[PDB]
C-alpha cells in the first residue's frame, strides 16, 4: 500500500508528460525528473512470466524506483538489474525479507538496511 | 470477422499478413506486430533467438508510433537515437522481406532460402548498428545479410 | 471510411495535440528569457536559425534574399542556445508580430538576439495554433466516429432482423 | 448515443464530480465549471444569486487561463489586478469545499450545512475582496464565511 502509493502517483504525473518524452530537448529539470522516474518505474513494472513474486520480494524492487536509487540507471539496463538484486535479497537478506512481511510496513531498521543494500550493490553493479 | 475472428485459437503459429504491407512492396506481407507463435519462448527457441526476436518487434513497434507524428512534425525535430531507431526499424522491415521460389515470377528475382542462423545473426547486427551506414534500399528483397551487403555496392555505382 | 481509419486518425492527431503543446511551453520560455535580454542590447543596437516551425520567419527573410542559421542554407547549430557576443533579420513587435570591426560585431549581435526573440515568438504562436487546430480536429473526428459507430452496430441489427423476419 | 441523449431531456442539472479535484483535496469533488443547472437563470433564482454565480464562474475560467503563464514567468509576473483574480480564485476555490456531517465520525470536524443566503454572501464578499488580505488556507473546508475569519484568526 506503502510504495504502491508513490508509484501510482508517480506514473500519473508522468502519464501527463510522456509524450513531451522523444521531443523534449530543452525541458525542465522537474519534467525531466518526471520522465527519468516515469522510464524507470516502468521497467520495474515488467516481469517474466512463470515467476511470480512473493509480495515483499515487489516491495523491495518497487523500493529501489520510488527512493530513486535507479534514476541514474539506463533504462535498457533494469531488467538485469532487478534480477541480480532480486537474486541477492533471497540468497544474503532473508531476514530483511522475513521483517518486511512480519512488520506490515517499512521499518526504519528496513529503511537502513536497504538504503545500504542497494547503494553498494547498485555501485558494484555499474562498476 | 467472425470467420477468422474464430479460427486463431485453434491455432499454435498464427502468421497474418497486411495489404498495407504488401502496398509497400514488402513480400512476404507478414505483418511482424501480429504474428504470433507458441513456441517463442526462451526456454525452447533460447535466449538468443528470443531477444533478437522482441527486439526486431520494440524498434519496430517504437518507429510505428513515431511515424504518424514525425510525417506532419518534421524529421528533423527527432533525437539522434531516436533518429537512429528510424533508420534502423525501415532496414529491418526490409530485411524481413525476401524473395521466394515460387514468386519468381512476380519478382524477377532468384529464390532464397536463409537457415535459422543466418536469420538471428543477421537481424542481431541490424539492432547492433553494424549497418547503419549501408543504405535502407540495400536490405530490401535479399535473403541472408551478405547479399544485403553485396547489394550495397552495386547501389554504390 | 471506417471505424478501424477514424480510430487510428484520432491516435496520431491526440499525439501532434499534445507535443505542440509542449513546444509551445518551450518556445514560451525561450521567448520570455529572450525578451527581457532584448531590452539592454536594443540601446546597445544604435551605437534566421535551424530549427523550423516558426511559420514564415525563415522564409520572410529567404524573400528579402553567408547566411547566419542553418535553415537559410537549405532554403549551423544556431538558435538553440540563447546566442552570446562571442556568437537581413526579423525585428519584434509583439508576440504575434516581427517585421523583417567592433560596430560589425556589434550589429552581428544586434541582429542576433533579435531573430531568436522573433523565433520564439513565432514558434509558440504557430504551436498554440498547431495545438488549437489538432484539438478542433480530435473533436470533430470524435463526432464522426460515433456516427459511425452507431450506425455500424444499427445496421449490423437491421440484418439480423431481416433474415429472422424472412423465415 | 441513444441512452444518454434521451436521458438529458429530463435533467434540470448535473453534478460532476470529478477526479482531478479530489487529488487537489477538494471535497466534495465537485467540478465547478462541469456541473450546469437549467434553472441558474436570474428570472428563476433571483438577478443577485444570477450575478454572484456568474462572476464565480468567470474568476475560475480565468484563472485556469493564467495558469499556463504562470508555469512560464512564474507568479510574480502578473499585473496587479491578475494578481487578485489568481489569490481570489484560489480562495473561491476552497471555500466551495466543505466539511460533511454524513464524515463527521471518519474525520473529527463538525460538519456543515450551509444556508442559501449565506453561500450567496460567501462568495459575494470574496469576489469583492473582502478578503484579500486573509490567508488563502483560511477558506478551506470550512462553513459560513464567519467560520473563515475563525479560522484566520486562530493561525497564530
Known amino acids: ?127 | 470477422d467472425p470467420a477468422p475472428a474464430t479460427t486463431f485459437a485453434h491455432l499454435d503459429a498464427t502468421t497474418v499478413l497486411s495489404r498495407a504491407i504488401a502496398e509497400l512492396g514488402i513480400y512476404p506481407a507478414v505483418d511482424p506486430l501480429d504474428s504470433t507463435s507458441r513456441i517463442m519462448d526462451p526456454n525452447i527457441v533460447g535466449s538468443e533467438h528470443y531477444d533478437v526476436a522482441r527486439g526486431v518487434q520494440k524498434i519496430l513497434q517504437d518507429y510505428k508510433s513515431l511515424q504518424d507524428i514525425i510525417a506532419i512534425l518534421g524529421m528533423d525535430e527527432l533525437s539522434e537515437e531516436d533518429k537512429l531507431t528510424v533508420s534502423r526499424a525501415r532496414k529491418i522491415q526490409r530485411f524481413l522481406s525476401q524473395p521466394f521460389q515460387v514468386a519468381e515470377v512476380f519478382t524477377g528475382h532468384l529464390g532464397k532460402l536463409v537457415p535459422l542462423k543466418e536469420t538471428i545473426k543477421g537481424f542481431q547486427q541490424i539492432l547492433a548498428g553494424e549497418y547503419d551506414h549501408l543504405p535502407e534500399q540495400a536490405f530490401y528483397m535479399v535473403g541472408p545479410i551478405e547479399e544485403a551487403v553485396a547489394k550495397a555496392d552495386k547501389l554504390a555505382e | ?167
Do not use: W
Not at chain 1, 508517480?10 to 525541458?27: K, W
Not at chain 3, 481509419?5 to 499534445?18: A, G
Open chain 1, 1 to 127: 500500500k506503502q510504495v504502491a502509493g508513490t508509484m501510482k502517483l508517480e506514473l500519473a504525473q508522468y502519464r501527463e508528460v510522456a509524450a513531451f518524452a522523444q521531443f523534449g530537448s530543452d525541458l525542465d529539470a522537474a519534467t525531466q525528473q518526471l520522465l527519468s522516474r516515469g522510464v524507470r518505474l516502468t521497467e520495474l513494472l515488467k516481469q517474466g512470466q512463470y515467476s511470480p513474486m512473493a509480495i515483499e520480494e515487489q516491495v523491495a524492487v518497487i523500493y529501489a524506483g520510488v527512493r530513486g536509487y535507479l534514476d541514474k540507471l539506463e533504462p535498457s539496463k533494469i531488467t538485469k538489474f532487478e534480477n541480480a538484486f532480486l537474486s541477492h535479497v533471497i540468497s544474503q537478506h532473508q531476514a530483511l525479507l522475513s521483517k518486511i512481511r512480519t512488520d506490515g510496513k517499512i521499518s526504519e531498521e528496513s529503511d537502513a538496511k536497504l538504503k545500504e543494500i542497494v547503494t553498494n550493490f547498485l555501485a558494484g553493479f555499474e562498476a
Open chain 3, 1 to 167: 471510411a471506417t471505424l478501424k481509419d477514424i480510430t487510428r486518425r484520432l491516435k496520431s492527431i491526440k499525439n501532434i495535440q499534445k507535443i505542440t503543446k509542449s513546444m509551445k511551453m518551450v518556445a514560451a520560455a525561450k521567448y520570455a528569457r529572450a525578451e527581457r535580454e532584448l531590452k539592454p542590447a536594443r540601446v546597445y543596437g544604435v551605437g534566421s536559425s535551424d530549427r523550423g516551425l516558426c511559420g514564415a520567419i525563415h522564409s520572410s527573410v529567404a524573400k528579402q534574399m553567408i547566411g547566419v542559421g542553418d535553415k537559410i542554407r537549405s532554403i549551423k547549430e544556431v538558435g538553440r542556445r540563447p546566442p552570446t557576443f562571442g556568437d537581413i533579420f526579423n525585428r519584434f513587435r509583439s508576440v504575434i508580430s516581427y517585421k523583417t570591426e567592433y560596430s560589425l560585431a556589434n550589429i552581428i549581435y544586434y541582429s542576433l538576439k533579435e531573430s531568436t526573440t522573433s523565433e520564439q515568438s513565432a514558434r509558440m504562436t504557430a504551436m498554440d495554433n498547431a495545438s488549437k487546430n489538432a484539438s478542433e480536429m480530435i473533436d470533430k473526428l470524435t463526432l464522426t466516429f460515433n456516427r459511425t459507430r452507431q450506425a455500424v452496430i444499427t445496421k449490423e441489427l437491421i440484418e439480423i432482423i431481416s433474415g429472422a423476419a424472412a423465415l
